Amino acid sequence: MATKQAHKRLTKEYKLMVENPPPYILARPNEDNILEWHYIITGPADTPYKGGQYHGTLTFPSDYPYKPPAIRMITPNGRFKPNTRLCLSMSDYHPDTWNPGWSVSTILNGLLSFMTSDEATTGSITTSDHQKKTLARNSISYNTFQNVRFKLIFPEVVQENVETLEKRK
């Protein structure tokens, strides 16, 4: 069981996202484990990610709020190696400078802003703009058929994706 402190904080962080949803970012705790969050980043305009659907996870440790989450991205994307901890300023590569007061939306906006930059970090990969665009186009099919956890966590989005894939055809 998560500590009562962590459970209270992370519940509040979800409510804050419901009340003020950050553009391009949907995220929520697992319904049976408040420490394991899943997110979907929608690729923004003005990037080669435009229209992509990028599933990943923010795994808060048992000692949250005093230790950062592990950040991973599951959907192939051309910027981050899939299923790999990512070295970001607000991540578990940086426990010494962790600020407990960072909100989940702040952490995720840090991931999105890093994604759309070209800075290398542990977990990043090198692809072309064309490869990123192909991965963005194919991300919805990927998450529907090649991503076992996506359907378990986001069944309502799988249902949307099926309709999107049909409308594309």
Author numbering: 1 to 169
Any passages from the paper?
Ubiquitin-conjugating enzymes (E2) play a crucial role in the attachment of ubiquitin to proteins. A subfamily of E2s, including yeast Ubc6 and human Ube2J2, also mediates noncanonical modification of serines, but the structural determinants for this chemical versatility remain unknown. A rearrangement of the Ubc6/Ube2J2 active site enhances the reactivity of the E2-Ub thioester, facilitating attack by weaker nucleophiles. Moreover, a conserved histidine in Ubc6/Ube2J2 activates a substrate serine by general base catalysis.
To uncover structural determinants of noncanonical E2 activity, we determined two structures of the UBC domain of yeast Ubc6 by X-ray crystallography to resolutions of 1.21 and 1.33 Å, which were virtually identical (RMSD 0.394 Å). First, the loop connecting the four-stranded β-sheet and the active site, which harbors the HPN motif in canonical E2s, is shorter, and contains a conserved GRF motif (called GRF loop). Second, a 12 amino acids long segment, which we will call the Thr-flap, directly connects the crossover helix α2 with helix α4, while the short helix α3 of canonical E2s is lacking. A hydrogen bonding network centered on Arg79 of the GRF motif connects these two segments with each other, the crossover helix α2 and the active site cysteine. In contrast to the published Ube2J2 structure, the active site is well resolved. It forms a distorted helical structure stabilized by hydrogen bonding between the side chain of Ser91 and Leu88. On top of the active site Cys87 lays an aromatic ring (Tyr93), engaged in a π–cation interaction with Arg85, which itself forms a salt bridge with Asp92. A conserved histidine (His94) points towards the active site Cys87, consistent with a role in the enzymatic mechanism of the ubiquitin transfer reaction.
